[PDB]
Amino acid sequence: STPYEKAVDEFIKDLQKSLISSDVNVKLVFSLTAKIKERLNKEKSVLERKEWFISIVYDELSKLFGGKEPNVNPTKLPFIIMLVGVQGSGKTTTAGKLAYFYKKRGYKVGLVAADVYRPAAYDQLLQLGNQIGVQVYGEPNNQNPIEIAKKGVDIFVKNKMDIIIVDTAGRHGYGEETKLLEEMKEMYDVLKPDDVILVIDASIGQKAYDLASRFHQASPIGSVIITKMDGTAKGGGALSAVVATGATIKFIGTGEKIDELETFNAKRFVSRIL
Amino acid sequence: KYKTIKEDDLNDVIEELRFQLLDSDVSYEVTEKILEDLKNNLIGKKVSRREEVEEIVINTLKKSITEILTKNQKTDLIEKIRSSGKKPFVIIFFGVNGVGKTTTIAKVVNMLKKNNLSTIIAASDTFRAAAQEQLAYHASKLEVQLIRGKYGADPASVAFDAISFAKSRNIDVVLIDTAGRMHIDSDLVEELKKVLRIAKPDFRILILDSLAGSDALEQARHFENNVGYDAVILTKVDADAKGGIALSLAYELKKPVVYMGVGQNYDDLIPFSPDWFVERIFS
Ligand SMILES: Nc1nc2c(ncn2[C@@H]2O[C@H](COP(=O)(O)OP(=O)(O)NP(=O)(O)O)[C@@H](O)[C@H]2O)c(=O)[nH]1
Ligand SMILES: Nc1nc2c(ncn2[C@@H]2O[C@H](COP(=O)(O)OP(=O)(O)NP(=O)(O)O)[C@@H](O)[C@H]2O)c(=O)[nH]1
Ligand SMILES: Nc1nc2c(ncn2[C@@H]2O[C@H](COP(=O)(O)O)[C@@H](O)[C@H]2O)c(=O)[nH]1
Ligand SMILES: [Mg+2]
Ligand SMILES: [Mg+2]
Numbered sequence: 001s002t003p004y005e006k007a008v009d010e011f012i013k014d015l016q017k018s019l020i021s022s023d024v025n026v027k028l029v030f031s032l033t034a035k036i037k038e039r040l041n042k043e044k045s046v047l048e049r050k051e052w053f054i055s056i057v058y059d060e061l062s063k064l065f066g067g068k069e070p071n072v073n074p075t076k077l078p079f080i081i082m083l084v085g086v087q088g089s090g091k092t093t094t095a096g097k098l099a100y101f102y103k104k105r106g107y108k109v110g111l112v113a114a115d116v117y118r119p120a121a122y123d124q125l126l127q128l129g130n131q132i133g134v135q136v137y138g139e140p141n142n143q144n145p146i147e148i149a150k151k152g153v154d155i156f157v158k159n160k161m162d163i164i165i166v167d168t169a170g171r172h173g174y175g176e177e178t179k180l181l182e183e184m185k186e187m188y189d190v191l192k193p194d195d196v197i198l199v200i201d202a203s204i205g206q207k208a209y210d211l212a213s214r215f216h217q218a219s220p221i222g223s224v225i226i227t228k229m230d231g232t233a234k235g236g237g238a239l240s241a242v243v244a245t246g247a248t249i250k251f252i253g254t255g256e257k258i259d260e261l262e263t264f265n266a267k268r269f270v271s272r273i274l
Numbered sequence: 275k276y277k278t279i280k281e282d283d284l285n286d287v288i289e290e291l292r293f294q295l296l297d298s299d300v301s302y303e304v305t306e307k308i309l310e311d312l313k314n315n316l317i318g319k320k321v322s323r324r325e326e327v328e329e330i331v332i333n334t335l336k337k338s339i340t341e342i343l344t345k346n347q348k349t350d351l352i353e354k355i356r357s358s359g360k361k362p363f364v365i366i367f368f369g370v371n372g373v374g375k376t377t378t379i380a381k382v383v384n385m386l387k388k389n390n391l392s393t394i395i396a397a398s399d400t401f402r403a404a405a406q407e408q409l410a411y412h413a414s415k416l417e418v419q420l421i422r423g424k425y426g427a428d429p430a431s432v433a434f435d436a437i438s439f440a441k442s443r444n445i446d447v448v449l450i451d452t453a454g455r456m457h458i459d460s461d462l463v464e465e466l467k468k469v470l471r472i473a474k475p476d477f478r479i480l481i482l483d484s485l486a487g488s489d490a491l492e493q494a495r496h497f498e499n500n501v502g503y504d505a506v507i508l509t510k511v512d513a514d515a516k517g518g519i520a521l522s523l524a525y526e527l528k529k530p531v532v533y534m535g536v537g538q539n540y541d542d543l544i545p546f547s548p549d550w551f552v553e554r555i556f557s
Contacts, residue, residue: 021302023487026293086485087510087538088372093403117538119411124404131403172485172513176537201372205299205487207515228371231456232496233489256371256402256454 005041007048012037015057022234022273025209028243036060061270065242070223070250070264073105074194077162080153082191084184084215085199087170090227090253092121094199095167096128097253097261102163103134110161112152113138114187115169116145125167132258145169146187153191166191173214181218188219197223198247204237212241221245227253230260236273276320279327284313287328291335298555300518301488304525312338336552339521343548346524348505350545351477351532352389355447360476362394362440362448366433368466368501369481370493371454374509374535376405378481379449380412382533384540387416391446394419396436398429398469399453409451416540419445429453429465430472437473450475457496466501478503484515484534491522498527509535512542516555520546 012033019029039056081098083091092115099109111129113136115121122138129136137152149166156164168187171180188196198212198221215221224245226238229252242249249264288309295305312335321330355363365382367375379395386393395413397420399405406422413420421439423432433450440448450473455462470478480503482490497503508517511534523529531546544550 017302020296021488023489026296086513088374088483090372096403118408120404120407123407127403172510174514175512177512201483201486203370203483203486203489205485205490205515206297207299207485207513211485211513228456231370231489232458232492233487237487 004047008037008040008053011040011048011050011053018274019236022236023205023208023240024236024273025206025240025243028209028240032060032064058267058270061273062266065239065266066248067266070248072101072250072263074163076194078157078160079163079195080191080193081163081165082149082188082193082196082219083165083167083199084196084219084221085170086172086201086204086211089170089199089201091170091199092124092167093128093256094225094227094253094261095125095165096132096134096258098165098251099129099134099163100132100258101251101261103132107162108160109134110152110156110159110164111136112149112156112164112166114145114149114152114166116143116148117169121167121169128258145183146190149187149191166193172211173218174211181214184215185218195222196220197225197250198241198245199225199227200238200241201233202226202228202231202235202238202252203233204241206237208237208240209244212244216245216247221247223247224249225251225253225261226264230254234273235269239269239273275323277323279316279319279321279330281313281317283327284316284331287331288313291332294555295518298516298518299484299487299490300521301491304491304522308335308338308521308525332556336556339555340548340552342521342524343551346528346530347548348530348532351505352386352391354477355391358476362437362445363477364437364448364450364473364475365477365479366450366452366470366473366475367479367481367507368452368497368503369454370456373454373481373483373486375454375481376408376412376451377538378507378509378535378543379409379451380416381535381540381543382449383412383416383418385543386447387418393447393449394421394436394440394445396433396448396450397422398432398436398450400427400429400432401453405451405453430469433469433473457493457500463500470501477505479532480506480529482506482508482519484508484511484517484519485513486519490519491526494519494523494527494529498529503529505530505532507531507533507535508546512536517551518555520551
């Protein structure tokens with residue numbers, strides 16, 4: 001066992017603990033670190049250089065979700081966004097934050113309240129819309145969320161909105177809620193959105209990979225927004241969700257206020273995860 | 275006749291157990307301590323020759339986890355309320371954003387109604403969009419009184435009015451909803467402490483999301499240090515979540531989980547049992 005080989009091994013062992021402690025999916029940590037270990041042994045007489053080791057970690061981790069700064073301005077207009085995610089993850093609030101972000105940039109924005117399950121879901125999004133001056137479409141008496149979604153999109157397209165953002169009910173997709181995944185798929189098929197955004201709580205633990213995978217199989221995830229980054233969570237579970245879907249992380253949420261949304265920064269996020 | 279357990283006998287099974295606990299969202303640091311406890315309890319112990327070391331290890335762990343949780347159990351909450359001479363018995367619910375406070379309050383109302391206890395709800399989240407409307411829907415469906423407070427009232431004023439109202443009507447229980455807040459948000463932690471000083475609750479419940487990883491323990495630690503609470507309710511266990519936070523809470527903080535939320539309907543609340551937890555994790 002060469003002094004270098006020993007150095008690599010201890011570094012990889014410490015990195016495994018660090019990533020797991022930050023809530024990256026355990027199996028993922030081992031496969032990721034296996035690739036990193038292989039690189040450290042093949043690339044660069046010399047002994048351990050931690051600085052080079054770390055650079056390879058940042059490199060392999062950055063690959064794991066894209067280097068490029070996210071593009072957050074819509075490709076074509078009108079641009080339909082459908083927000084999805086686990087109960088309480090921050091979807092309704094993030095819809096308001098997104099509407100605010102784009103309005104500030106000079107877009108005509110419409111919000112669609114397509115959650116018919118949560119009490120006062122409509123009232124919540126209407127209040128956010130009222131606060132930031134963005135029109136909200138909803139039908140509090142309608143129990144068909146797809147019909148609301150479609151009618152809302154159609155009206156906003158007709159009236160030449162640039163960006164249309166559809167809020168949907170919370171779901172996790174397990175047990176009875178497998179049917180909610182089917183409903184999400186159906187909404188996806190009907191709206192044909194331009195971006196399906198998985199909105200995910202930064203604090204999410206070891207279920208993240210399998211849960212995000214279930215979502216992706218039902219309706220392909222294009223983008224991810226990580227909420228509650230103003231908290232103490234490292235965010236490794238959110239990283240796991242991103243790897244399961246192949247999606248691009250575009251924004252993080254940094255508070256409850258409507259302006260507390262910012263573009264995702266890969267380097268800082270790696271540093272946060274550690 | 276009996277073989278002596280050595281460290282080398284334990285290595286393979288300790289690693290399988292480590293990954294099982296980690297997968298169950300028992301945090302890394304707690305998992306390590308528990309397994310170190312396990313190894314130390316077993317190194318030097320005798321065992322029959324045709325007995326499988328691996329099984330004794332697994333059973334010793336299941337038994338230790340069961341004891342850690344069983345020792346932390348307190349009196350049942352309904353029995354606590356019934357035995358209390360206080361009217362109303364005042365309960366407050368707090369925790370970080372989106373974990374499930376408001377919905378859990380509705381389930382608790384439902385459970386209290388089934389136990390023939392009268393209840394009113396204080397709508398003391400006066401910040402978040404539609405927070406009072408959301409509770410008003412549940413209050414109406416559960417047919418219980420919601421106290422919204424005067425127009426523009428702050429959380430403490432709403433709670434004060436709710437308690438005053440319950441006193442004069444001899445209502446058994448007041449349940450106080452509060453806005454989501456980060457455990458590291460000093461201003462909002464102060465807002466909560468202000469409601470506590472004014473409401474002087476008889477029971478304080480932290481809500482934790484069972485889908486949360488290691489941060490759930492961090493939430494629990496910080497809130498215990500800055501605020502203090504009596505018990506935890508874990509939500510969203512129906513998302514195929516193991517709820518390993520339950521073990522970490524007992525092991526690190528000596529705090530019990532009293533109920534678990536297992537869906538979005540009012541009946542979706544079960545009491546916490548050590549045996550149930552151990553079966554979930556190891557089966
Ligand atoms: N501190 C903080 N709070 C946030 C952030 N994003 C959302 N929230 C808060 O998180 C809570 C849940 O938000 P909400 O929009 O209702 O989430 P949701 O996913 O629509 N819930 P549901 O699944 O029930 O429809 C709210 O208290 C909201 O203010 C964030 O970045 N930071
Ligand atoms: N599947 C499932 N969903 C749950 C459970 N408990 C709560 N929820 C859902 O989680 C979402 C958030 O619940 P809510 O009561 O608004 O949480 P909150 O902590 O009061 N949010 P806020 O911080 O904004 O006030 C809702 O969709 C609610 O129905 C549970 O046990 N299982
Ligand atoms: N009990 C009851 N709830 C209803 C009915 N129609 C809609 N809801 C509830 O209204 C809510 C959706 O409308 P709002 O977003 O406007 O609250 C959901 O909680 C839904 O269950 C009904 O006929 N009866
Ligand atoms: Mg919502
Ligand atoms: Mg609430």
